[PDB]
Automatic annotation (TrEMBL), chain B:
This is Uncharacterized protein.
TrEMBL record, chain C:
It comes from the Eukaryota. It comes from Toxoplasma gondii. The lineage of its organism: Eukaryota, Sar, Alveolata, Apicomplexa, Conoidasida. This is Uncharacterized protein. The chain holds residues 226 to 310 of 310 of the full protein.
From TrEMBL, chain F:
It comes from the Eukaryota. The chain holds residues 11 to 118 of 305 of the full protein. This is RNA-editing substrate-binding complex 6 protein domain-containing protein. It comes from Toxoplasma gondii (strain ATCC 50861 / VEG).
TrEMBL record, chain G:
It comes from Toxoplasma gondii (strain ATCC 50611 / Me49). This is Uncharacterized protein. The chain holds residues 280 to 384 of 1012 of the full protein.
Amino acid sequence: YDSRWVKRLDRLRESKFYDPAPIIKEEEILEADKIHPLLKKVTPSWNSRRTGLLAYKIGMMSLWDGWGERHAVTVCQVDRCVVMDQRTLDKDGYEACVMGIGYKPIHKVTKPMLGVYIRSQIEPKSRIAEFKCSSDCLLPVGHEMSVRHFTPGQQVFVSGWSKDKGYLGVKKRWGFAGQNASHGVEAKAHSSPGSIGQSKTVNVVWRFKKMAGHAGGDPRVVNCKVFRIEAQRNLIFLKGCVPGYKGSLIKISDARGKTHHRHNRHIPLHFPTFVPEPGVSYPVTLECPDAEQDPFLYPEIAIADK
Amino acid sequence: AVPKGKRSKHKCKQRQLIYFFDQFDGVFKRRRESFYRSFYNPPYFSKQTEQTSLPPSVLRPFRFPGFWPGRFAFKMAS
Amino acid sequence: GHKHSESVLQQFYNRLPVRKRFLKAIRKGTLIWDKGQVKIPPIAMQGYGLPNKLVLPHQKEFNNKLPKFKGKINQLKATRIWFQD
Amino acid sequence: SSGLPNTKRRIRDPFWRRSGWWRWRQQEVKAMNRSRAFRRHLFPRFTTETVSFVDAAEAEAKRFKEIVAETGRYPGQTVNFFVPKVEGAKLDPFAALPSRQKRLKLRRKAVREAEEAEKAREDADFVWRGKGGGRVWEERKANIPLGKKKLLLYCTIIKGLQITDAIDWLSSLCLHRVNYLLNLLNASRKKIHEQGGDISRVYVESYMLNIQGQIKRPQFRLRMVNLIKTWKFAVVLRFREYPMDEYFHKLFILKHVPRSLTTDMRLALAGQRVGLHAVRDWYPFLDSKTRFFHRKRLKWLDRTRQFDYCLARRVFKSKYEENCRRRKIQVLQARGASDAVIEEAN
Amino acid sequence: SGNHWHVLDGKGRSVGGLAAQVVRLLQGKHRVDFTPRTAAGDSVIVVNAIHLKM
Amino acid sequence: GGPGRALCTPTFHGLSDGPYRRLKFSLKPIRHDYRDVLVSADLRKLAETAQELLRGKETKRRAFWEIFSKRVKASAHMLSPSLMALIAKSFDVHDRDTGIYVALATVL
Amino acid sequence: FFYYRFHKRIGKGNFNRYLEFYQKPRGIENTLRLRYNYTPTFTAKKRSEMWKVNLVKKIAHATDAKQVLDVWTYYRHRRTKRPYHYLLALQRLVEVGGCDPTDFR
RNA sequence: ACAGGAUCAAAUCUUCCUUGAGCGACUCGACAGGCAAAAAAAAAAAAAAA
RNA sequence: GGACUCCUUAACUUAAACUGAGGAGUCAAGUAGGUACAAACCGUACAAGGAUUAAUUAUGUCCAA
RNA sequence: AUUAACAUAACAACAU
RNA sequence: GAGUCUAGCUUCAGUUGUUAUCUGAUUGGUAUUGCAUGCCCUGAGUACGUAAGGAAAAGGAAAGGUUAACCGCUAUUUAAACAAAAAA
RNA sequence: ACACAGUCGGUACGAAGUCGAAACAAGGUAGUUGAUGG
RNA sequence: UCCCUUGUUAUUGAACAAGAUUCAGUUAGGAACGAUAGUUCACCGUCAGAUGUAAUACGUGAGCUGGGUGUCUGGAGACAGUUUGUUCCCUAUCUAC
RNA sequence: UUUUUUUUUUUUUUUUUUUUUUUUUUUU
RNA sequence: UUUUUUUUUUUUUU
RNA sequence: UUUUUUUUUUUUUUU
């Protein structure tokens, strides 16, 4: 809450106050204190669907691969995603799971909200979302989600909000052609929209007409690829691009339709969740398998005129 | 363009109230609150106006003597 | 629509609450509209008499004397058949 | 913030709402508001008599005109008829009756006489009046270079507010042409104070605008000559004094205390100009939270048959009168006057 | 209370006829004291709507 | 104009006239204690009426008797052993036998 | 109420190959508040307003918990129930010789 | 809510019935926050104590 | 030195609301009714005036009525 | 001193 | 009475198109494909045909083009140049 | 107000009582009930 | 049923490949330039995007213009953006002994 | 350090994403 | 009459 | 075979 010129100097000076990097291990062992007693393995069915996850956009990065091809990947962090409540047909009328994410100061949370958290036995949350899934994939209350839910090398469905650009013109928003810069052209005609309708035969402008206005701030969805995951820090690297600001909430789910059919067919995935067995170690870091063929192979393409 | 017809009284009447609310919510209300804050601080004294202006003061008067307990004036000395 | 003026016959068709599929057929001629229903146009057989509902009042006496068909379409043996206008 | 109004403000609309503000919804909303409003009052459970307000001069004018209308003559005339006003006639047929200012003066004298007579009655502590009584004053201010549009904005703001409050409201504007109104306000306050009325109980009733004229000027253009003019309006204001009875009911019950008073109180408290005993005394009128909790406790007490309206009114009036009397006594003593002079003055 | 109820069984009945009949009841024209200004009708309940014919 | 007839449009209208065509409706104060009624009497009103019958020698009407009997009959299962004696003694003193004695024999 | 909006939309469902089950549905189709667009008459108003008195009158007349409950149930839809109404019913229920707490009524 | 009720009566840990669907779910009852200063692409960031 | 319709008929592409003739109605200068929506068609015991009444007409009789 | 157009205010209303 | 998350309704085009009988302790019982420009590869020098000549079922990929999103890399433009020591 | 901003028409007090309801009949006593084998 | 993409498999003087006429949908995805200015047509050269029609007042001139076979600062409709609220401007004063 | 295409990524979902509105309240 | 049914068919004549 | 027509303002075809 400082001044402009104080904030600007802060922005520059922040770099000098960075804590040392953690120490990442090669192996991980879990005990009974991190496992839901109610958690068990369930065989999937033909009409079974899994749950989604929430993430925060951190930033972009470039990473190599086994063949040596560089790719751009976005980093996402699951900020302690925990199940709050469940929905049943008898109780509510539909199967769903409610989850929470984030943290809020106690000096900002209302009493009715704090009542929920007391029951839940969890710290205050910033955001709450819900997922629709099949009845056979209802996770127990209080279970903490992990990055291990998605296996590397599978297609994911990512949803989020776009950025904001304020007010923009017709030429700026849509990308109109306009008029020439010369050859006897009026000032106003430079960036004018031109015809916007028909003659007296149609006295009404059709709905959904492309016009000037505030731009940005819309929902958008995109496909992504799981490139790398981290268990320690709970990090996920997604191949492609994700909308929203560097910190905005984003939803991640499995493939749907063609995406599933074509890609997510031969990939074994833990349907309910990751279920570690007490007394056994697990990897910390998992990488995407390399391709089959050499990417750096330029065969000959015949060019014959006829 | 040019107007095709005359505006009725009703419209004008409506507009009046619209405008009044618009202004009140954005000018007057802000100004009032800004004005009222200065009370805590001593009044403003201008150097330019010193030729005619009264001496400086700090103490504020009480407009409502009815709800003013405690002594009001001091007895004259011998 | 965009057209300013339209024929009354076309307009009539335009007002029919039916699917596009049947609309097309109706327009073509394969189908007719009558009594709020859609049915096959009447069949005119060579030599046989036409329905009494399509001839003029003075032509009914002569139409009733002509031969009549009391069989199925498969059993029909007419040299030529066409829809009656 | 710093040279920029907040972007996230909320501007009210009197004719539209995102939650719906249709005709049908208006009815319901109004009904509920009225219902809630009505219930906020606290009437006494026991009264001896109810005395209403009436204007003798206004009744006499109607009585004088009714006889002329129905009989066609004047009071006492037995030979002659009524002559109405005619074009070019200098004589006013209704010249015997008083004017508005004279009737207001008669009212102001009658209310003083009634106030003096009130002390004789022994059962004056259990008598109802309602609303309407009080002295009335009227002023005027002409030659104002402002139109109706401009005038209305200010007028509506100042309407239904305390004399002192209005001054502040107009002052806060930081405008130039508002000085004309400011001067009228200040002159009215000074005149009312000199007339002996209590300026602490004086409220703005209503207003009135009168068109005076226009001053046109030439304005040349490329292919025409427009006419530029100036506005001229006159503002008429009305003031009314709130009796003790009325005053009590509005501050104690309704809790519709002005802002100036509360600001003064808070100022004194913050500056330590008073002791610890005054905070509690002003608790009913200090802050909005205290007012609300006080009103809720009042309602509970009332329902419990624990609260005495007449007793609270008497305590209120006695405290106010004692403070007013002590102010004058101390002011007189400050000059060093003798005991005989003090006794004769008060 | 003055509120009357009519529960019908529309099983194998014609939509048009049923509608026509219902209209009468809804309108309240069947009563002597019919007022077009107001709704003088009575509540109507219909079941087995799936069984209609055309 | 229109597809239909314009004249064939019945309009509601009164066939007579009277002074009560514009009498406003208002909610009058509602009784706070409805139990005070003999019809809707209670154990207290029953006992009070029984005491009054034993005190006075007045010859009451048939209606009173009827109503009193019916109420008692209705509410027979709520009476106390002490109140039953009073209610039966009232009847015995007034020489009335309306089937009351048989009904009270099941609850006594 | 110059204009009262009310439309029956085509809701999502699956009626194809429907099997007749002798069971009640979830709930009523129509739930929207019914708002009249006309001023009521004297008789209408009276019928609408008589409940306030009839409730108490029948409560008083009642001679058993069954009757009490029934009476209460009948005036279910009756909005704007004053506190004292509850008190009255409670007193009557206690006088009648108790009641069934478990009762839906 | 194991809150109420029946029975020659229940594994630890209610055999069975009622609560119309325990008010759509949770929670609160001094609950909740419009405007001002300051900050402010959406959004987030201040415990109280002049 | 006339606009629509009925019978006859000249011209035209047996075309056009055209151009022009013979003899009846209506409008022009006609109300209200019917014909779904804008003079010309049907009917009229066809509009001095007022009211809470009865009738075979074009024509209608499942709902809007 | 003075009509209308025009400008402002007060009172009056409940089957809503 | 109030806070959160939600049921129903609404949504570019458009439809009503789904389950008799029922492995006897013998590794078990339909399953996210609506959709579609051109050129190249496997199938294939195969079907076909004297010869020349030369297909489909399925998948895989390199250009061009449209929409949307974003600033990890490259290109254009452009801004900033300030508080580690409690001996300071 | 949907209206070229109009015209016609426009609300039927009591029981909101009750120590009534007796000179119909019956009566599971409710100031209850009157026809009807599809 | 509109130039290409669909109707495995019988309309064919259809061996394959490449082709011609006709019909059908729950209406799905697409179709690049230049020179001469003879108001537009046969034809000409390149990428081969692979034989590429009409209506809407020339569709469109209070949005723009050109070598001939005028001006206008948007009052109401429509369309594209935006709207705290029951209260937080003012006012809203029973019953009657 | 910011903006942009001259760079990069997707071309999937439509009972989906999303949303301003809890409705047994028939005369506020 | 049988989910046989992109322009392909069977059974029975209702 | 008939009642049901341009009923072509809407619903409906209940025979």
